[PDB]
RNA sequence: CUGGGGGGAGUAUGGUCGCAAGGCUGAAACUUAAAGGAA
């Protein structure tokens, strides 16, 4: 759904996000500081994010090739 | 006649928590009691040039010209500002 | 002949991807319906920086200034200096050089001269601690942003020595099918031309917000004394969260201005960082552009990187549309096979990129 | 006009007027110890009293009587207060060699200006509320920029002690009278000394500038009060 | 009916005493007889 | 082309200023390389 | 209470890892007090 929305290129990007639910500015969009203060007064939301040579090269490239197939 | 040192001590007693008066007085006595950076001719009937200042502008001019040519030397592009 | 874009959005990314791909572009209608229409001075000086970095690229600005023609050339690098204007800091010009940086004849040794920081741009600590590690594990190994002196706005007067000296062939294919465990959380609180107590006030505010998570918080402190302080008073704070087993990092920064409480700014940057951790998965919302750019100019293989639901936005998909508009490649968002969260894994098959400027 | 607030050496404050007799009211136990400096707000309805009992207090005018409502206790003997001329900042000079700038609307602790190296007398805030002065017994006045709390000059005047320092109404020029029988006229742009006025004989305890126009009176230890106008 | 607030204003001369002197200066660039 | 020796230096105001403040540093620290009477 | 590199006396070092200089202190965002040092 989302890939077809992204590459369907006759609709605006905010319309893609709207029917799914600008880079000179480097730092991304954040909320107001007051909304973020009441949102992150709690902390428990993200506590689980917190806490021979020749055959070796051939094994790395065959690992990449099987990744290629199983993702194709 | 009298010494440049005697005239310099007299000029300091003349000029004497303000700052800009001292900046002005120091710059005045420096460019007055420095006679080897002007050039004086003799009037046959007199400051006629400023050698060090003319030299430094003539060599800074060709210094920026030389750096500009060294910047140009192996370029091939250029923006074309038609504005 | 020319791939045509409209509007003055994503301007640096368009010129950067045109330099990478070697495709002549036109950007039309640079703010044409405006009172002072056309290109602005900071993006004109960015064009001058592109002419400094490359060689044989012809840029052709129009009469009205509202359309530009970029016919790219070979990235050659060399040593340079860039006196960027007061409208944008040095981060606005060193951010798009990190894409072109490892793909040149001679290594990048540039020093930018101007304002160091801005509210809406990248800082020295942002560029260094956030954007250098993603290049450091995408394949480069010797890259360094040095501060020789830094200048807070409005007068600035700070110089920044960007030196990259690993000229790789192409970036490696990324494989991040995990969410990296955050091992530590560090940072840097800087202040120039003000009292040294503001830094400790910023650090204490950030760490009193951070104190309830059971990790380890460490914020380093630098006041800048002397000629290294620049021409204006300023202070700011940049936190990173550090996954040490792989090297990943998630950053957030800001700067204070005339009338700003340092404990307020410290707790604001702390909460903004925790929200970046929330809305992040293996990248940041601002480290994501050059991450997927290096994935798309990697080898001719599949490289896959995990992202979450909230990192998709109009900026991210206008990036993807510009990527496909220039060199005709798509991303494939496959979802993960476990359902306590909404994370895609973006697989990009990279184009067959090599750097052909480095002499053999 | 026609109404005077005053604080005394002991814990007492007092109010008088011009038409009627002395005492509107006194407030016994206005403070626990010696009061040191008070300041009205620019509308006058709310005044600030800082005293040597390590406290400042705020008072309102209820109808013509004084209403104590809030009190900020510090760690150290506050000995000068001032507000900005546009109700914006509250700068208070402590005995601990520093001043603190607060926001009146929050008691926010905006700034701490530090580095004077003796206990610090009179403050003044400029008309644009951008530039403060800071006098002390270190024989020098410091100019501070209030936006970031950054110092500008540290000019050494007055070889005994600067008792008071006051701006002009509309300009960044200011006056400072000191404990060595001299008042001094400065500018806040070149930081020169405009004038060195030499009429007193002993310790000049206070000076006050006109609200508009700018003629300044100075009053001293030799029981003298003298006016200073323009040429 | 008094509203008694407190204050604390610790000074940070040690933050300049622990500036880039040695460690941060080096790190902020990356028998008998 | 390559050239044999460096030319004689032109004496401008910058080099006289640098030389004079060198002299001023020496003359206010009394760093004088005089002969000392035996 | 079993485990071992390779002679003695030196010398050099554009390699790697360290430790180390400046320069009156106070004193910097402030050309700023007292006091001390030096001569």
Curated annotation (Swiss-Prot), chain B:
It is found in: Nucleus, Nucleolus. Residues 41-62 are annotated as: Disordered. Residues 17-22 have a biased composition (Basic and acidic residues). Belongs to the NOP14 family. Involved in nucleolar processing of pre-18S ribosomal RNA. Has a role in the nuclear export of 40S pre-ribosomal subunit to the cytoplasm. Interacts with snoRNA U3. Interacts with EMG1, MPP10 and NOC4. Component of the ribosomal small subunit (SSU) processome composed of at least 40 protein subunits and snoRNA U3. This is Nucleolar complex protein 14. It comes from Saccharomyces cerevisiae (strain ATCC 204508 / S288c). The chain holds residues 2 to 116 of 810 of the full protein.
Curated annotation (Swiss-Prot), chain C:
It comes from the Eukaryota. Keywords: Acetylation, Nucleus, Ribosome biogenesis. It holds the Pfam family RTC_insert. GO terms for cellular component: 90S preribosome; nucleolus; nucleoplasm; small-subunit processome. GO terms for molecular function: enzyme activator activity; RNA endonuclease activity. It is found in: Nucleus, Nucleolus. The keyword Acetylation applies. GO terms for biological process: endonucleolytic cleavage in 5'-ETS of tricistronic rRNA transcript (SSU-rRNA, 5.8S rRNA, LSU-rRNA); endonucleolytic cleavage in ITS1 to separate SSU-rRNA from 5.8S rRNA and LSU-rRNA from tricistronic rRNA transcript (SSU-rRNA, 5.8S rRNA, LSU-rRNA); endonucleolytic cleavage of tricistronic rRNA transcript (SSU-rRNA, 5.8S rRNA, LSU-rRNA); endonucleolytic cleavage to generate mature 5'-end of SSU-rRNA from (SSU-rRNA, 5.8S rRNA, LSU-rRNA); maturation of SSU-rRNA; regulation of rRNA processing; ribosomal small subunit biogenesis; rRNA processing. InterPro entries: RNA3'-term_phos_cycl_insert (IPR013791), RNA3'_phos_cyclase_dom (IPR023797), RNA3'_phos_cyclase_dom_sf (IPR037136), RNA3'_term_phos_cyc (IPR000228), RNA3'_term_phos_cyc_type_2 (IPR016443), RNA3'_term_phos_cycl-like_CS (IPR020719), RNA3'P_cycl/enolpyr_Trfase_a/b (IPR013792), RPTC_insert (IPR036553). PANTHER family: RNA 3' TERMINAL PHOSPHATE CYCLASE (PTHR11096), RNA 3'-TERMINAL PHOSPHATE CYCLASE-LIKE PROTEIN (PTHR11096:SF1). Present with 10000 molecules/cell in log phase SD medium. This is rRNA processing protein RCL1.
From Swiss-Prot, chain D:
Involved in nucleolar processing of pre-18S ribosomal RNA. It comes from Saccharomyces cerevisiae (strain ATCC 204508 / S288c) (Baker's yeast). It is found in: Nucleus, Nucleolus. Interacts with snoRNA U3. Interacts with MPP10. Component of the ribosomal small subunit (SSU) processome composed of at least 40 protein subunits and snoRNA U3. Belongs to the WD repeat WDR3/UTP12 family. Present with 9620 molecules/cell in log phase SD medium. This is U3 small nucleolar RNA-associated protein 12. WD repeats lie at residues 30-60, 115-145, 157-187, 199-229.
Curated annotation (Swiss-Prot), chain F:
Transmembrane segments: none annotated. It is found in: Nucleus, Nucleolus. Belongs to the MPP10 family. It comes from Saccharomyces cerevisiae (strain ATCC 204508 / S288c). Involved in nucleolar processing of pre-18S ribosomal RNA. Required for the early cleavages at sites A0, A1 and A2 during 18S ribosomal pre-RNA processing. This is U3 small nucleolar RNA-associated protein MPP10. Component of a heterotrimeric complex containing IMP3, IMP4 and MPP10. Interacts with snoRNA U3. Component of the ribosomal small subunit (SSU) processome composed of at least 40 protein subunits and snoRNA U3. Interacts with the SSU processome subunits EMG1, IMP3, IMP4, KRR1, NOC4/UTP19, NOP1, RPS4A, RPS4B, RPS6A, RPS6B, RPS7A, RPS7B, RPS9A, RPS9B, RPS14A, RPS14B, UTP1-UTP18, UTP20-UTP22 and UTP25.
